[PDB]
Amino acid sequence: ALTKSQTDRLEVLLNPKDEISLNSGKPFRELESELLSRRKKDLQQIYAEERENYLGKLEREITRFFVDRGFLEIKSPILIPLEYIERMGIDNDTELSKQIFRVDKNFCLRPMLAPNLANYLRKLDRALPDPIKIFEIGPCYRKESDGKEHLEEFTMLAFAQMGSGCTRENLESIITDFLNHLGIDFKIVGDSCMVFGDTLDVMHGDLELSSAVVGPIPLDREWGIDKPWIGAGFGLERLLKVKHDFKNIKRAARSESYYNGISTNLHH
Amino acid sequence: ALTKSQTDRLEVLLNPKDEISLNSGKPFRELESELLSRRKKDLQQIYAEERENYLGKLEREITRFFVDRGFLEIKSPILIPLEYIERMGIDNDTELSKQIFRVDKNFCLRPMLAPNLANYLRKLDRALPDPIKIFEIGPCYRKESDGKEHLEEFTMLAFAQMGSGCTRENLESIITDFLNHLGIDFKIVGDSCMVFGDTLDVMHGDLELSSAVVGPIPLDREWGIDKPWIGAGFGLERLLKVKHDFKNIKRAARSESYYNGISTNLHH
Ligand SMILES: Nc1ncnc2c1ncn2[C@@H]1O[C@H](COP(=O)(O)OP(=O)(O)NP(=O)(O)O)[C@@H](O)[C@H]1O
Ligand SMILES: Nc1ncnc2c1ncn2[C@@H]1O[C@H](COP(=O)(O)OP(=O)(O)NP(=O)(O)O)[C@@H](O)[C@H]1O
Ligand SMILES: [Cl-]
Ligand SMILES: [Cl-]
Ligand SMILES: [Mg+2]
Ligand SMILES: [Mg+2]
Ligand SMILES: [Mg+2]
Ligand SMILES: [Mg+2]
């Protein structure tokens, strides 16, 4: 019989590979010591043989994927004008506007990559040939209720193509090649969101891995875009959660409490 | 005779490779058109042959360097408790405390990597053998007066070693191998800052590339560290500025106005 505090403690030390039961007869200290030893050996092995962080490693693999397929790598500001949020159609008093991390009077931490990538599409239209293909990977921020699938600080991949080839079939083809490369099974379901209209949601079971959009849409005019486009946004921590079978997305996050899904709190 | 507005416009279109003079007899529109054509061909070439962003590429090269030399790659939160800033000795009413980007009541955008890496050193001490070596690359935030060497949103590399081998000689040796790898000449000068005490500042001419610290220092006790350590922090945008000979650090920043030092504003 373990307390909730004892059960929580063993939960954070448990890893998906473990075949260890908390409802066995073994006392708490005996269970904690064995798990502590396992998590120490896991960090030791990483320290000796790999030393790469899962979230950084995935970013590098995704970067290579899209660069090799003709997409320009973008690194745009994380801190952006609050006015970009308005021009996306996210008015005040809308439920999405209350997820915005505001900074000073006129800036915020970006909740999405779309505004910056939209400016890059319009600007790069003066220089690059058809089609224009870009992508960015970086931090995004949303105030969220507590949940095993949501983080307030997460990492988004967003890619976009503008010009020729911007069909639903091509968008699904890119998504399929991308998730085939990561080795992640998925299905596509139609849904609607209140920024882009109807989207294609990329589902792993009931977990949304991505929302993809087939342009053009009326919002394009507010950004100086008048060509067809296709795009999608993926959550890297959600990709890692599925890939490594984490029960809670905190295991995949920028964190001081977990490293590659291994608890960093290895005290007794 | 060009106006200040005309001169500013040609300045942003000029690249360090260009051998073009603004005080020649050529009219403004003729100068702008030639530079616009050059910057279009530069983006075209990147789009066709490389497609990597300088800031992301440098991050990948630095990551590989430190991983190959036994340092564990860390990805920690960018949004951190305001209380971490206090425990670094940055009290209110101190000049450094007015550079902090505050978020909500109790959080801020990290102005440095030291607090998070200090927690990782203490936690990893329970698991990893001697010496413990870690590093992180990621965004940091400081309110700054306008200047050609400062950004409000920049990218910091910080590495640390804890345990044996934590001498000034070894710290300088790592710095030398690191900047030799990037191909950057530098000198080391003694200076003092009001968080760590005396530091070793890594200078490229008059531009500070890094501040390095030989522990132990009295601040260590506030973080649960009681072993010797050595560490340094580098600005990636400053490394790129020196490497590519940018006159203004805006050329090396996360930006919607420059890509790999090339203006994205290619209108007339
Ligand atoms: N708070 C979050 N934490 C982690 N990943 C997130 C978060 N919000 C969005 N993402 C990811 O980013 C992708 C694109 O953003 P978006 O489509 O706006 O999110 P979303 O539809 O609100 N997902 P959800 O909040 O679960 O209904 C999503 O499909 C997720 O994979
Ligand atoms: N505002 C900034 N913009 C760009 N790089 C910066 C900025 N602040 C610090 N850095 C870089 O981060 C390194 C480590 O941080 P730190 O030593 O605290 O900066 P610093 O001593 O205040 N440099 P400086 O403001 O020029 O006197 C510096 O050596 C710089 O290379
Ligand atoms: Cl997005
Ligand atoms: Cl630092
Ligand atoms: Mg949501
Ligand atoms: Mg969605
Ligand atoms: Mg300073
Ligand atoms: Mg300094």
Side-chain angles (χ1 to χ4, degrees), chain B residues 112-114 156 158 196 233:
Chain B
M112 48 180 166
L113 301 179
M156 192 184 298
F196 303 100

Side-chain angles (χ1 to χ4, degrees), chain A residues 47 73 120 123 131 255 259 265, chain B residues 47 120 123 131 255 259 265:
Chain A
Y47 193 46
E73 174 190 24
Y120 259 98
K123 293 163 185 276
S255 178
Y259 182 88
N265 294 292
Chain B
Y47 193 46
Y120 259 98
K123 293 163 185 276
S255 178
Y259 182 88
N265 294 292

Side-chain angles (χ1 to χ4, degrees), chain B residues 142-159:
Chain B
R142 299 181 186 189
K143 296 172 178 166
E144 308 272 14
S145 72
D146 315 80
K148 58 165 183 171
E149 323 283 8
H150 286 79
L151 299 157
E152 297 200 311
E153 166 179 69
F154 64 103
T155 317
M156 192 184 298
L157 155 73
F159 66 82

Side-chain angles (χ1 to χ4, degrees), chain B:
Chain B
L2 308 175
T3 63
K4 182 50 168 49
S5 177
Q6 284 170 337
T7 291
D8 289 335
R9 173 53 176 167
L10 301 176
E11 211 79 71
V12 315
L13 297 175
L14 264 186
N15 269 12
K17 68 159 198 182
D18 293 323
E19 315 283 341
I20 297 191
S21 183
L22 306 182
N23 276 258
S24 63
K26 311 179 181 185
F28 166 79
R29 296 167 56 215
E30 171 177 329
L31 295 169
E32 191 195 26
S33 172
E34 163 80 19
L35 293 177
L36 288 173
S37 286
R38 298 196 175 195
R39 304 290 82 84
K40 285 170 185 172
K41 295 185 185 174
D42 288 342
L43 296 176
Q44 288 162 13
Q45 172 184 252
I46 296 171
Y47 193 46
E49 293 173 332
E50 261 278 292
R51 291 178 299 279
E52 299 185 56
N53 183 271
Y54 278 174
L55 191 57
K57 188 172 175 181
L58 181 58
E59 169 173 349
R60 288 185 291 276
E61 303 173 339
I62 296 170
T63 292
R64 191 48 39 193
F65 180 89
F66 280 100
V67 162
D68 288 341
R69 283 145 190 90
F71 296 70
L72 186 70
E73 174 190 24
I74 306 292
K75 290 293 181 190
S76 69
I78 302 167
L79 199 61
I80 65 168
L82 210 56
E83 202 148 64
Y84 286 11
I85 299 308
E86 304 182 25
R87 297 168 46 210
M88 292 294 299
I90 303 183
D91 185 45
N92 296 119
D93 307 317
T94 71
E95 296 308 307
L96 315 172
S97 74
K98 301 308 154 59
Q99 303 194 96
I100 306 285
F101 282 98
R102 203 163 165 190
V103 184
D104 300 331
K105 174 139 196 174
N106 298 321
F107 286 87
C108 67
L109 304 175
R110 62 192 184 185
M112 48 180 166
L113 301 179
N116 287 348
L117 298 190
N119 289 324
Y120 259 98
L121 288 179
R122 180 190 69 254
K123 293 163 185 276
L124 295 164
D125 197 39
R126 303 182 172 103
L128 301 187
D130 173 79
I132 296 184
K133 303 149 73 176
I134 65 176
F135 79 102
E136 178 164 2
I137 307 170
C140 293
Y141 293 87
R142 299 181 186 189
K143 296 172 178 166
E144 308 272 14
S145 72
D146 315 80
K148 58 165 183 171
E149 323 283 8
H150 286 79
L151 299 157
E152 297 200 311
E153 166 179 69
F154 64 103
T155 317
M156 192 184 298
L157 155 73
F159 66 82
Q161 178 166 330
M162 183 184 58
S164 64
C166 297
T167 66
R168 173 176 180 164
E169 293 88 359
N170 196 29
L171 173 65
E172 294 196 18
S173 181
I174 301 165
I175 292 169
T176 298
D177 288 339
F178 173 53
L179 292 175
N180 283 348
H181 186 75
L182 300 188
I184 288 178
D185 274 86
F186 70 101
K187 53 180 174 179
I188 296 189
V189 188
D191 207 345
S192 66
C193 76
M194 292 293 98
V195 180
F196 303 100
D198 304 330
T199 74
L200 302 172
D201 269 28
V202 183
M203 304 302 289
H204 185 93
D206 297 320
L207 178 66
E208 172 186 330
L209 297 190
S210 171
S211 277
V213 180
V214 177
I217 63 183
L219 190 59
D220 296 343
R221 300 192 308 277
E222 289 287 299
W223 294 90
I225 287 161
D226 60 355
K227 291 188 180 179
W229 63 272
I230 51 180
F234 282 79
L236 270 74
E237 292 85 4
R238 288 195 181 174
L239 295 173
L240 284 172
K241 170 170 175 171
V242 171
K243 172 171 182 182
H244 299 272
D245 211 36
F246 298 149
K247 300 316 170 303
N248 194 313
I249 198 178
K250 309 295 172 301
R251 303 283 187 125
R254 290 178 176 274
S255 178
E256 303 176 296
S257 301
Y258 296 94
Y259 182 88
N260 292 3
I262 300 152
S263 176
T264 60
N265 294 292
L266 300 179
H267 53 84
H268 290 279

Side-chain angles (χ1 to χ4, degrees), chain A residues 22-235:
Chain A
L22 306 182
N23 276 258
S24 63
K26 311 179 181 185
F28 166 79
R29 296 167 56 215
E30 171 177 329
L31 295 169
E32 191 195 26
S33 172
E34 163 80 19
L35 293 177
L36 288 173
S37 286
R38 298 196 175 195
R39 304 290 82 84
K40 285 170 185 172
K41 295 185 185 174
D42 288 342
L43 296 176
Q44 288 162 13
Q45 172 184 252
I46 296 171
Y47 193 46
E49 293 173 332
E50 261 278 292
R51 291 178 299 279
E52 299 185 56
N53 183 271
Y54 278 174
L55 191 57
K57 188 172 175 181
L58 181 58
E59 169 173 349
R60 288 185 291 276
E61 303 173 339
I62 296 170
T63 292
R64 191 48 39 193
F65 180 89
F66 280 100
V67 162
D68 288 341
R69 283 145 190 90
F71 296 70
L72 186 70
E73 174 190 24
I74 306 292
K75 290 293 181 190
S76 69
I78 302 167
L79 199 61
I80 65 168
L82 210 56
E83 202 148 64
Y84 286 11
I85 299 308
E86 304 182 25
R87 297 168 46 210
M88 292 294 299
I90 303 183
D91 185 45
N92 296 119
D93 307 317
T94 71
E95 296 308 307
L96 315 172
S97 74
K98 301 308 154 59
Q99 303 194 96
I100 306 285
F101 282 98
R102 203 163 165 190
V103 184
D104 300 331
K105 174 139 196 174
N106 298 321
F107 286 87
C108 67
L109 304 175
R110 62 192 184 185
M112 48 180 166
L113 301 179
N116 287 348
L117 298 190
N119 289 324
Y120 259 98
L121 288 179
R122 180 190 69 254
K123 293 163 185 276
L124 295 164
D125 197 39
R126 303 182 172 103
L128 301 187
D130 173 79
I132 296 184
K133 303 149 73 176
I134 65 176
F135 79 102
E136 178 164 2
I137 307 170
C140 293
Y141 293 87
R142 299 181 186 189
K143 296 172 178 166
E144 308 272 14
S145 72
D146 315 80
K148 58 165 183 171
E149 323 283 8
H150 286 79
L151 299 157
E152 297 200 311
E153 166 179 69
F154 64 103
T155 317
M156 192 184 298
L157 155 73
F159 66 82
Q161 178 166 330
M162 183 184 58
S164 64
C166 297
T167 66
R168 173 176 180 164
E169 293 88 359
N170 196 29
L171 173 65
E172 294 196 18
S173 181
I174 301 165
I175 292 169
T176 298
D177 288 339
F178 173 53
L179 292 175
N180 283 348
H181 186 75
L182 300 188
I184 288 178
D185 274 86
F186 70 101
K187 53 180 174 179
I188 296 189
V189 188
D191 207 345
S192 66
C193 76
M194 292 293 98
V195 180
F196 303 100
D198 304 330
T199 74
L200 302 172
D201 269 28
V202 183
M203 304 302 289
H204 185 93
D206 297 320
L207 178 66
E208 172 186 330
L209 297 190
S210 171
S211 277
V213 180
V214 177
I217 63 183
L219 190 59
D220 296 343
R221 300 192 308 277
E222 289 287 299
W223 294 90
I225 287 161
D226 60 355
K227 291 188 180 179
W229 63 272
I230 51 180
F234 282 79

